[PDB]
Amino acid sequence: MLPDGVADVLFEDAHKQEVLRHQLTQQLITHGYQLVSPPMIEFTESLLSGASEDLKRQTFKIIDQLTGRLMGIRADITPQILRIDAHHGGDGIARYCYAGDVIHTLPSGLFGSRTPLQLGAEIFGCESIAADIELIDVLFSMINSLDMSAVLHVDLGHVTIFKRLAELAALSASDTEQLMQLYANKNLPELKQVCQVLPMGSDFYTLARFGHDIANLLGRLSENAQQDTKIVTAIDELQRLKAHLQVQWQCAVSIDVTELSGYHYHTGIVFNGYINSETQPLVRGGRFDGPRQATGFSMDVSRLLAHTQLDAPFIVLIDYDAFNNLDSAQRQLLLQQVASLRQQGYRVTMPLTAEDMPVGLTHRLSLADNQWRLHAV
Amino acid sequence: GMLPDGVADVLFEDAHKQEVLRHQLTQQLITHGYQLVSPPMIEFTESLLSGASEDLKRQTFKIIDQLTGRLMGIRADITPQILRIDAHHGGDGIARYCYAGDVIHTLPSGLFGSRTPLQLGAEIFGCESIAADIELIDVLFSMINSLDMSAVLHVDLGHVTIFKRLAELAALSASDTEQLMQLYANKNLPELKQVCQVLPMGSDFYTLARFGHDIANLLGRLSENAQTKIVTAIDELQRLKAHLQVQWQCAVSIDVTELSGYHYHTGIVFNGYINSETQPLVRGGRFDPRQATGFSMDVSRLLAHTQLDAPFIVLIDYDAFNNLDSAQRQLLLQQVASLRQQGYRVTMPLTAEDMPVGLTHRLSLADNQWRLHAV
Amino acid sequence: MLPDGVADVLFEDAHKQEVLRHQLTQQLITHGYQLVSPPMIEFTESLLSGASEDLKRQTFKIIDQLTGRLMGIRADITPQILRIDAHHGGDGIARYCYAGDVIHTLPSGLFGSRTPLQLGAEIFGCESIAADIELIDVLFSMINSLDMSAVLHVDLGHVTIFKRLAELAALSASDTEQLMQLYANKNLPELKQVCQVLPMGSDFYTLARFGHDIANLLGRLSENAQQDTKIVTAIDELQRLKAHLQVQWQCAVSIDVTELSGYHYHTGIVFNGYINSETQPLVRGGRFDGPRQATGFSMDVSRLLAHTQLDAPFIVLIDYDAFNNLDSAQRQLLLQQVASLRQQGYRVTMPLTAEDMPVGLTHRLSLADNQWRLHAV
Amino acid sequence: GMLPDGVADVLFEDAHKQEVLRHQLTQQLITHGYQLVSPPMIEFTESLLSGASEDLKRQTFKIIDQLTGRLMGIRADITPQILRIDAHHGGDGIARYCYAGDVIHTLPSGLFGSRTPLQLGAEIFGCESIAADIELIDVLFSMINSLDMSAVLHVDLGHVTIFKRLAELAALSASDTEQLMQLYANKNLPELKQVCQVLPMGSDFYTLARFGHDIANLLGRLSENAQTKIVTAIDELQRLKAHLQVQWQCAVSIDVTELSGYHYHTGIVFNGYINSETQPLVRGGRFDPRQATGFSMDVSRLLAHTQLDAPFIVLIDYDAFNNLDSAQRQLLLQQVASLRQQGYRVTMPLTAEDMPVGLTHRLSLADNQWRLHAV
Amino acid sequence: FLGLTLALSKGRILEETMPLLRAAGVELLEDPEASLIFPTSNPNVRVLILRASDVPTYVEHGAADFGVAGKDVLLEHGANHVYELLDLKIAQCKLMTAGVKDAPLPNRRLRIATKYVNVARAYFASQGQQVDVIKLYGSMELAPLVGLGDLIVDVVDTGNTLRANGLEARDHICDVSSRLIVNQVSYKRKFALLEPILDSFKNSI
Amino acid sequence: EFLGLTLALSKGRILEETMPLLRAAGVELLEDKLIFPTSNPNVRVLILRASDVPTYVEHGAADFGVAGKDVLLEHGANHVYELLDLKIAQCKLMTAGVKDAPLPNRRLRIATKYVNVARAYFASQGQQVDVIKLYGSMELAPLVGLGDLIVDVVDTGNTLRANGLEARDHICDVSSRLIVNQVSYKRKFALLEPILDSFKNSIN
Ligand SMILES: Nc1ncnc2c1ncn2[C@@H]1O[C@H](COP(=O)(O)OP(=O)(O)O)[C@@H](O)[C@H]1O
Numbered sequence A, C: 001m002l003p004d005g006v007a008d009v010l011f012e013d014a015h016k017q018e019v020l021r022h023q024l025t026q027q028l029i030t031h032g033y034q035l036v037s038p039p040m041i042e043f044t045e046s047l048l049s050g051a052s053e054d055l056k057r058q059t060f061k062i063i064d065q066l067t068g069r070l071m072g073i074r075a076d077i078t079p080q081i082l083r084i085d086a087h088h089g090g091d092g093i094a095r096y097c098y099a100g101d102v103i104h105t106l107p108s109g110l111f112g113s114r115t116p117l118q119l120g121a122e123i124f125g126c127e128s129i130a131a132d133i134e135l136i137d138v139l140f141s142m143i144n145s146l147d148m149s150a151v152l153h154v155d156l157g158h159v160t161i162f163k164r165l166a167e168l169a170a171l172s173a174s175d176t177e178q179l180m181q182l183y184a185n186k187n188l189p190e191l192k193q194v195c196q197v198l199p200m201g202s203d204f205y206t207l208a209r210f211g212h213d214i215a216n217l218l219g220r221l222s223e224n225a226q227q228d229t230k231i232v233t234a235i236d237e238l239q240r241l242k243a244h245l246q247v248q249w250q251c252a253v254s255i256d257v258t259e260l261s262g263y264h265y266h267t268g269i270v271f272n273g274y275i276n277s278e279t280q281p282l283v284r285g286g287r288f289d290g291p292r293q294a295t296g297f298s299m300d301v302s303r304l305l306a307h308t309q310l311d312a313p314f315i316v317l318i319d320y321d322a323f324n325n326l327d328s329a330q331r332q333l334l335l336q337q338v339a340s341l342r343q344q345g346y347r348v349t350m351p352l353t354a355e356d357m358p359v360g361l362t363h364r365l366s367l368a369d370n371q372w373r374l375h376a377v
Numbered sequence B, D: 001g002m003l004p005d006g007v008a009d010v011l012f013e014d015a016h017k018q019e020v021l022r023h024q025l026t027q028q029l030i031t032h033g034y035q036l037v038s039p040p041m042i043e044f045t046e047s048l049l050s051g052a053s054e055d056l057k058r059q060t061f062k063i064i065d066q067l068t069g070r071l072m073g074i075r076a077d078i079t080p081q082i083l084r085i086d087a088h089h090g091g092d093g094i095a096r097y098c099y100a101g102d103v104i105h106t107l108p109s110g111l112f113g114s115r116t117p118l119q120l121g122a123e124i125f126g127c128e129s130i131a132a133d134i135e136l137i138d139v140l141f142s143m144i145n146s147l148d149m150s151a152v153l154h155v156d157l158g159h160v161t162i163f164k165r166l167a168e169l170a171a172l173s174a175s176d177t178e179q180l181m182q183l184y185a186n187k188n189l190p191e192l193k194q195v196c197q198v199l200p201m202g203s204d205f206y207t208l209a210r211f212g213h214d215i216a217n218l219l220g221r222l223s224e225n226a227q228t229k230i231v232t233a234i235d236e237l238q239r240l241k242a243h244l245q246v247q248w249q250c251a252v253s254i255d256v257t258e259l260s261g262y263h264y265h266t267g268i269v270f271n272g273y274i275n276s277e278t279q280p281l282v283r284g285g286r287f288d289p290r291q292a293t294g295f296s297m298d299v300s301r302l303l304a305h306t307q308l309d310a311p312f313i314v315l316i317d318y319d320a321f322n323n324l325d326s327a328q329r330q331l332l333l334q335q336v337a338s339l340r341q342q343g344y345r346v347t348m349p350l351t352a353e354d355m356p357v358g359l360t361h362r363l364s365l366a367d368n369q370w371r372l373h374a375v
Numbered sequence E: 001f002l003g004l005t006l007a008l009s010k011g012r013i014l015e016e017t018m019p020l021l022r023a024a025g026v027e028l029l030e031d032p033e034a035s036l037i038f039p040t041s042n043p044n045v046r047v048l049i050l051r052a053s054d055v056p057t058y059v060e061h062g063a064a065d066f067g068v069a070g071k072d073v074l075l076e077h078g079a080n081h082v083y084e085l086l087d088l089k090i091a092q093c094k095l096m097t098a099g100v101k102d103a104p105l106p107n108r109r110l111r112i113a114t115k116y117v118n119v120a121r122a123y124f125a126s127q128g129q130q131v132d133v134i135k136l137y138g139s140m141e142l143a144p145l146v147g148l149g150d151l152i153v154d155v156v157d158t159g160n161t162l163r164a165n166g167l168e169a170r171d172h173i174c175d176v177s178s179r180l181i182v183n184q185v186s187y188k189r190k191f192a193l194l195e196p197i198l199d200s201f202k203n204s205i
Numbered sequence F: 001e002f003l004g005l006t007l008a009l010s011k012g013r014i015l016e017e018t019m020p021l022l023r024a025a026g027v028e029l030l031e032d033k034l035i036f037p038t039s040n041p042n043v044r045v046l047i048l049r050a051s052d053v054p055t056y057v058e059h060g061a062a063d064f065g066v067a068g069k070d071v072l073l074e075h076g077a078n079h080v081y082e083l084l085d086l087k088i089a090q091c092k093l094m095t096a097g098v099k100d101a102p103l104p105n106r107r108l109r110i111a112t113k114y115v116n117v118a119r120a121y122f123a124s125q126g127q128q129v130d131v132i133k134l135y136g137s138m139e140l141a142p143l144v145g146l147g148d149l150i151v152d153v154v155d156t157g158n159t160l161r162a163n164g165l166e167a168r169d170h171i172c173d174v175s176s177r178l179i180v181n182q183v184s185y186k187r188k189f190a191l192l193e194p195i196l197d198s199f200k201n202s203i204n
């Protein structure tokens, strides 16, 4: 009955989603990220400014009946944070967090969602790798708070590396697109072939062959490459984050400098967190562009639902008959008691009729020797 | 004005406040025993706009599922989605639901109205008794009272059953009713008395608009033919009027010519107005062989009239932090961790100039002890 | 009952419109312009490629339900001719004509139409002023065929002139926009003021003050200006067309080199024809851009309706009674006769009933001494 | 595929052909005494979609009048506009109208159908008699015969009155009819016989689908209750069937279960199919206390099956022209002017290389005489 | 201010309502015309004096709780977001089409120049006549005489102003009298304060 | 019938401040009656509301006129020519609010005559607003919270202070301008050229 990649989230899953959304949102706020809550729709002029072709295609279109102009139902909040920071951010450092629904026209992955609950954070106005470390800390505080048996595996990349080789090797638009597609498919055999002809082609093969080993990667590259500062800084950045994740958070990190998804928008380091053996990364972060520095991540909160569990809830019913036998003053006392229970987080239903039964009923609040008490069913 | 009309960012402290309200109110409802449900932003129109009025259909943006070529809609009201959920999972007994979620409208509701409200509401299915409507009234007013507003909610009751039974027992033309309704909506009384002089039972239809507000005597002013479902309706209205005055000390007004949602409302209606604002803050009523009743509100409209405690926004000293060795940093982080749990907003500075907005305190080092001091 | 700038065209006006549309269309075809009939709607990608901001705002938007993409109801056909010539035109000279309805969101002029019947011609692939002369000839053949008492007055301009002064005077985006707005409003006093400070400002004042006199305009300009070939060619072009219109067509021409409507799309000469004392030009032509040369004009055919008149029509009714009294063979003969009349263009109605009466009835076809004959009412 | 589906350029000779057809057919209608009217592409929806079916409403693109904030539509059918025109200017007597104009559809009509047809049609108002339907049939077939097509028009008659009277005299549910109609549209006979075994008079409703094609005996197969408006309807159908066979030698088929336009058709319907194509080329019928009847066609669909004479595309010699003096040029232009009036397509070359497409002749100078010769 | 605020038009309306106001226990303390907010003998009522075309705007937005304004303004402005409780039968006139004296309507499409743009479009729509409407804020008698419009739409009681400017009434659109309008919220919230005043006025009529 | 120029004028502040330019151009009004003669028989004057001047001029029921740039900006001067800034009847379009009151938490409501000016300005300052149309005097609107701010013309500020208000932002400067109907500028230039030259002279 519902479109593909569109699902109800109901009852305890819905409560769990509320809890996660709220806890994670507040965690970010306490780390000093300003919460911002942009709208579901904007005019396309603002919504899809600087937008990729994949983003434009993912964004449903609708017509503002008041102006006859084109609007869109957002597919990513990240551009909205750019807009907000353009207006209110100033030249200094600015921090933002956000949680909100976004809509996609098509699923990303096999049976993937089209109505994800996008939650994320961002730091603008800092060039230093220290900002990327902050977000890594903020992120991992969040993940650790969830008490998952699920294991997050993290993959680092750096699009700058391949960008500087392609520039220093004077690569044709088509050649790059070939290299990129080969990398994406990890065709090493055919990569070694196409590189034997291409200028610096040793270097492009070394990326795919010895990328994972970030310690020694720079030593394996050409003199022209090793001279260049943008390649050398990129390899340092990658090494710093690799360490910090292992040391400070005890994270299993792998390097892949051939990871060039978002070659257009990523202006450097990239982060991809995978939960257990799932194909779509749970978390996607990286360096991008506001002439304003910017970096940050996002996640679909709804995908945490499978790998998180709340304590079982206490769902309490008051006895209809016993309640109605009480006099005014006894009712007051019971209500004051039931009020107290609700504050403690108990789910107490005041029955309208004898048959009124809450779903998942765990306890009854019943009268016994002039005392109201909880007993299991 | 870079955003469409009735579309606004909610930012920074207002955004934090909105999160807090949304969460507190949602949990309040959960603790009153309403099951939270979170239906999606989009459905196929078949399901989304089943039994939908013409106003609802027009308010609901349309989009195309590229995978099936079918029509979908970006919801403008969650209430129908709760019907669908209760149809599948509700069963024959009593069921309670709450929800909070964004909805989109094609056009503003009235004067300067929002088109992207944050719709929060509750509903009770499977109870015919007026006692279910009293529960929701109590649940609602507990929620409102928890907000510590200086703002005063004024409440308006109506009952679409009354005008439905007159129109049926006067055998009314589709056009006639639509005229009466438009006149009522405008309270154009002179022209109403005119159009009623020709229409059958038209005395009765004019008495509704003229002596509706006086619910005590309303039945006595109607025709002999009028004086079953009409008789219950005036009693219902009188019971709720009382309950609101007594139990909550609420200023109630009656208006039986309130017929917004003539299509979906199968009886009593509720409209709460905050201070002197035109759009009601709260909209509830009886709807629908399964009984149903409940309300909703735009959480975002509470923002003006609600106020959180001032926040503690803490900055660690850049220099002092960097002078620490590994082990001292761990201890400071454990301390800062503790502060964050207490709800303090602590920023770890990337540079000497890194300054949080609204800075209330500094966490500074003195004789090997970190402490908070105000600026 | 109808939106502003939206009107029925009915009965004889409608017949007149059909006639004009057809005659003018065929005239163009016989001058060797290929007729092309592009659709009312396209995807915006194609429809508004290279579009101005005024064009984008004039173009209603709608959603393709089959793809969820944005489409538009065209407001000008000229871009569609570009598209057609891009695909089918080749490197050589190509000629196109077109007549079709276009829709505007807002009127151009006071109580102006929003549903004009846009008719026009275009020549691509010729740099020479000879192509602009052809269109002038084609146009004036068309206008002369209409037998109007109405007088077409023509205004020539050249945006190249002001473009070269602004370039050779190194003008700031704002300065130009001031000059342009002043020109548009013919504020000469304030123009002479703002020019006393601006570089080459003598030249910009000479445009507004002595533009109308194209014979001597070049002699009044600075040495820097007179040296430049693009200004000198522009003044020659203007002089050639001025003459050709007076000589070959006996046209009242005025020059206005400060006419810079369409500064963005016009890449040179411009043409504006005004019918009697109407403010909106009836015809708008000029040099523009396909690296492909292009030039051409258009007109709203519907605006010719007021200033054109067809011969009164013969609206004929056969007598009901007399017809039915005839036998099979007599009916055949009458039908063969009525067939002949229709070919001659007579409007003959075969009555269904005695009361059947055509509107504007001019004649009856009646039986008299065994002869069917026409008689006026 | 750079253009939306069901949207195509019509270019060059096809475009010339379309102009010619549109014009010839339009004038044919004018000479038969139909007043030409040219209503606009857009109206306010109030006027455009008054009395409109649900299929018509869905086919009609919506847009916003920025001057009034109101809803307008880009027409999908001109037929309603002719109603409006006749309401204002028609009077009580007989009125005839013809029209040709572009219309836009949101979705294709059927398999690979156009969304930007060039709708041409005629209509007669104010005549109850079957004689008006015969006139239009004659007018139509004169038009088709003038086209010199090898293509064969096959015609299908129906009558919505029949099924309307059964549904009324069986007291049918809104849903039931919609089921019957969908079944009929699909000619799912097995399932039709099933659903009829339960439905009232359902024998009759099955006999429509099963023995509709046999109009001679159709009435004899219906119930006693069925055997007034139903009786005229079968006669009407029989009269037109004959007239088409006799007067035009037309292959006619009957199908009384053709109920496209159940909302607007108040009786007889006409559907002409060209060769083996699925979408009818021509669509006519009785509609609507003012009588009305008429047809329409997409002129663009005639393009495949119609052929104009080859054109004479003439080029003047560049060199020879330029060698002339002023006075000789005048004489040549007067000669070329004459040729253009005769319908020749004469191009005045801008350069030596200037070559018209489809060049048939050259106009060349020889011993002080210009003449035409083929290439 | 927790009592009622009353929206009123200077001059003709104020003067013709004061007898209803005095009878409802509402007397203004100063004379408005003698040199913006005014008290009254009832301390829970006050009065705002504005242009007659702004009364519905102040009432619908609730910056006044209730008001008196001519049906000409309500029709033109649209009374969507207010309640029209009482026809006060005061300040009476009519909306009419007007043209130059004895001159016939011209051949071409009609140009109407008027304040009452929506009234004009609505009326001439009801008479099946297609027109061009021209918005005027100032007095409209001049417009026909310099052919800005062919006709005008204006209020007329006697037609002296019309004849004095060489014009004459042509068609009767509808009757006009000032009406009592009430903000929709104010009618629910402050009915207790309104009921007496409404009853007085209603009695007075 | 009348073949000379018709001049559109606003009664009060404009008429008074233009008469020195008019007298200098050989145009003296005979009286101080809807249409008015002048000493020049080929000129006449229409007195109308200042917001109607552009309407009468663009439609050609007057050949030319004087109206404030506040009206031209609000009305749109698309179909007229703005020939001369007359540097008379000067003022400014400004946003105005109540004395010392801060801007409220919620979205700003502006109440004003100058609706399009307001939307255009607050658009340029990237601020989203609710605009409320007033025909009458706007000083009252803040005081009964119809709007938070207003847009109005102000020379000195005395009317603003006298109603407990104060200027907040400077939108743009204002002075009455000379506007000419587009046709009238082509057809009757011979009659206009002297008058334009006089005015231009009397400016400096
Ligand atoms: N001459 C008149 N005689 C009687 N009633 C009038 C007359 N003119 C206007 N009215 C009515 O009185 C109302 C008040 O208008 P008026 O006092 O003239 O205000 P304004 O001068 O600001 O237009 C009008 O809306 C109309 O209903």
Ligand SMILES: Nc1ncnc2c1ncn2[C@@H]1O[C@H](COP(=O)(O)OP(=O)(O)O)[C@@H](O)[C@H]1O
Pocket: F010, F011, F012, F013, F014, F049, F050, F051, F067, F068, F069, F070, F071, F089, F090, F091, F153, F154, F155, F156
């Ligand atoms: N205080 C002022 N000082 C100078 N010019 C003003 C002032 N107020 C308005 N103006 C300008 O001069 C004109 C004078 O206003 P006025 O004619 O009194 O207005 P209205 O006709 O609306 O009553 C305005 O139309 C405006 O262009």
Ligand SMILES: O=P(O)(O)OC[C@H]1O[C@H](OP(=O)(O)OP(=O)(O)O)[C@H](O)[C@@H]1O
Pocket: E139, E154, E155, E156, E157, E158, E159, E160, E161, E162
């Ligand atoms: O035809 P009459 O019976 O005279 O009434 C019609 C007049 O009523 C109004 O004038 P008002 O008295 O308000 O004077 P005003 O022109 O100063 O507004 C209106 O402006 C008309 O001129």
Ligand SMILES: O=P(O)(O)OC[C@H]1O[C@H](OP(=O)(O)OP(=O)(O)O)[C@H](O)[C@@H]1O
Pocket: F152, F153, F154, F155, F156, F157, F158, F159, F160
């Ligand atoms: O700030 P100040 O310099 O004192 O001037 C401001 C006032 O002047 C203008 O017209 P005015 O009120 O003078 O006359 P009007 O109402 O007839 O326009 C304007 O409408 C303001 O109300």
Ligand SMILES: [Cl-]
Pocket: A188, A189, A192, A209
């Ligand atoms: Cl290898």
Ligand SMILES: [Cl-]
Pocket: A261, A279
């Ligand atoms: Cl991936």
Ligand SMILES: [Cl-]
Pocket: B018, B019, B022
């Ligand atoms: Cl939230």
Ligand SMILES: [Cl-]
Pocket: C188, C189, C192, C209
């Ligand atoms: Cl000069």
Ligand SMILES: [Cl-]
Pocket: C261, C279
């Ligand atoms: Cl122009």
Ligand SMILES: [Cl-]
Pocket: D018, D019, D022
């Ligand atoms: Cl055509």
Ligand SMILES: [Mg+2]
Pocket: none
């Ligand atoms: Mg008045």
